[PDB]
């Protein structure tokens, strides 16, 4: 069934499950042609496939070459997502394959279901949650590796850095989505908050700064305040 605020805690049980977000698979800039018509230019994208319990992230870089000579690309992006997600499952030992795949957008249900026909016992599920995974390309290291790619490529990350050494997956995922929500709503301010202090660096094998526990509290409070300020502004409340 669909995933919502009721069954939120199911993410963190010991049933393996992956989130799939396709929002950044097909990315274009829009520009004008010499004759004054509008045209798109595609840039590299990514499939964002995430295990919310372990933080492991299967970032599949989608090279602009895949669009070459293709029509109805926004439709095709969904089918390529499903194809790449299926191959990732197939590439994983059985005991690591997920029991559920939750797509962040309901339009991915049919493409994935059709591609997963070989895995009838993997349940493909929608969500009603409003997850901010589209903001992944606001994570500097993630955007960097996507934009530099010359070819299709799979890059692995732990999107929680080493947080789980000290906090639960429930807490780690609430931090991750808070940070991404903030980045989504006001990237410049979100990024300002994360980097203002030059003496808290990002480890080479990490995505976020090495905040201590107390400093994460302050940061989380600052991100909270940012999101509410921006909400007032949007709705003049």
């Amino acid at each position: 069934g669909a995933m919502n605020s009721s069954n939120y805690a199911e993410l963190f049980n010991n049933d393996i499950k992956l989130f799939v977000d396709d929002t950044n698979v097909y990315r274009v800039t829009v520009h004008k042609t010499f004759e004054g018509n509008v045209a798109t230019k595609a840039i590299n994208g990514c499939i964002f496939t995430l295990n919310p319990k372990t933080g492991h992230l299967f970032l599949k870089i989608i090279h602009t070459s895949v669009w070459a000579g293709q029509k109805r690309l926004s439709q095709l992006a969904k089918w390529k997502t499903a194809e790449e997600v299926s191959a990732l499952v197939r590439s994983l030992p059985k005991e690591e394959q997920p029991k559920q795949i939750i797509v962040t957008r309901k339009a991915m249900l049919d493409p994935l279901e059709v591609h997963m026909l070989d895995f009838p016992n993997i349940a493909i599920r929608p969500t009603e949650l409003r997850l901010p995974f589209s903001a992944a390309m606001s994570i500097d290291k993630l955007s960097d590796v996507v934009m530099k790619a010359t070819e299709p490529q799979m890059v692995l990350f732990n999107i929680y850095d080493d947080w789980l050494d000290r906090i639960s997956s429930y807490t780690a995922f609430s931090r991750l989505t808070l940070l991404l929500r903030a980045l989504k709503t006001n990237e410049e301010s979100a990024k300002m908050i994360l980097l203002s202090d030059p003496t808290i660096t990002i480890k080479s094998y990490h995505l976020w700064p090495s905040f201590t526990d107390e400093q994460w509290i302050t940061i989380e409070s600052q991100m909270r305040d940012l999101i509410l300020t921006e909400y007032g502004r949007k709705y003049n409340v």
Binding site: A82, D110, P111, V114, H115, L117
Partner: protein, 300 residues
């Protein structure tokens, strides 16, 4: 012309024969239906005055035997039975006509409606869907489930319609996932027509049988089957031109015969808007589109 006699009418019942129907009263002198055209399948069906649930009935072909109706008070329903003694049977039929206690299959000579609803329905294919090989006729009622429905419980009483599933290995060639799901042409033409049905007339016959079951019994699973088989064609980019033209005729007469007040449960909004307006075949059902728009514009 053929005859189906009734032993008696013990209980009040609305009797249908094909698209026609009559009210018969408890122990009214009623002894059957005469002048039934030979050359087509036929369906005699019932709805008791005391139970508007369960419509039931028997599909048959007069060329396959002498058939008659007899009420069973243990089971409480009108049963169809075959008389093997041709002499005895002409004898009963003749006496009841002499006494004029039979209704006449009331065909207008201009009207091809029943032909058009059953053109491709063969009694032999019916008997594979309703498996009960001790009888030459086939029982169907409102509550019977299909095989596909039994997969999602007594198989003896199942409607064995051909199973169609758009999200299945059968429908989707590995490697052509996107192509085969958006363009069901390979599933229709290779898997279903060439593979399973062998030709379009068997496909069509099952499509028409499905509809009539939905229509005369409110059989829900038959309604499902009918829409699936329409959907499979409309969602195929490559259909024999003779099939599209015959489909438009078939659907036209189905829509035309449907009771107006049943359009809500018997027509699936999604399938129809897809066939008529979205699918590859949006421009290929001109007669069906026109009757749907002038008779059920709300549904669209």
């Amino acid at each position: 012309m053929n005859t189906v006699p009734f032993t008696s009418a013990p209980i009040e019942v609305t009797i249908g024969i094909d698209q026609y129907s009559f009210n018969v009263k408890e122990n009214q002198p009623f002894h059957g239906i005469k002048d039934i055209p030979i050359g087509h399948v036929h369906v005699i069906h019932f709805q008791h005055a005391d139970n508007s649930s369960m419509r039931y009935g028997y599909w048959f072909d007069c060329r396959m035997g002498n058939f008659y109706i007899q009420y069973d008070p243990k089971d409480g329903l009108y049963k169809m039975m075959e008389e093997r003694d041709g002499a005895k049977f002409e004898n009963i039929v003749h006496n009841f006509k002499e006494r004029q206690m039979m209704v006449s299959y009331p065909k207008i000579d201009e009207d091809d409606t029943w032909y058009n609803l059953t053109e491709f329905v063969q009694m032999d294919k019916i008997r594979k869907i309703v498996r009960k090989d001790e009888n030459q006729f086939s029982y169907v009622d409102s509550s019977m489930t299909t095989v596909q429905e039994n997969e999602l419980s007594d198989p003896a009483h199942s409607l064995n319609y051909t199973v169609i599933n758009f999200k299945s290995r059968e429908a989707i060639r590995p490697g052509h996932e996107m192509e085969d799901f958006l363009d069901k042409s390979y599933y229709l033409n290779t898997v279903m027509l060439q593979g399973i049905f062998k030709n379009s007339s068997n496909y069509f016959g099952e499509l028409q049988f499905a509809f009539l079951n939905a229509m005369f019994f409110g059989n829900y699973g038959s309604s499902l089957q009918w829409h699936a088989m329409i959907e499979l064609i409309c969602s195929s980019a490559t259909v024999p031109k003779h099939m599209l033209d015959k489909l438009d005729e078939i659907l036209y007469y189905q829509i035309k015969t449907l009771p107006e007040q049943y359009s809500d449960i018997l027509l699936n909004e999604r399938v129809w808007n897809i066939c008529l307006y979205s699918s590859f075949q949006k421009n290929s059902l001109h007669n069906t589109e026109k009757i749907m728009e002038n008779k059920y514009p709300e549904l669209l």
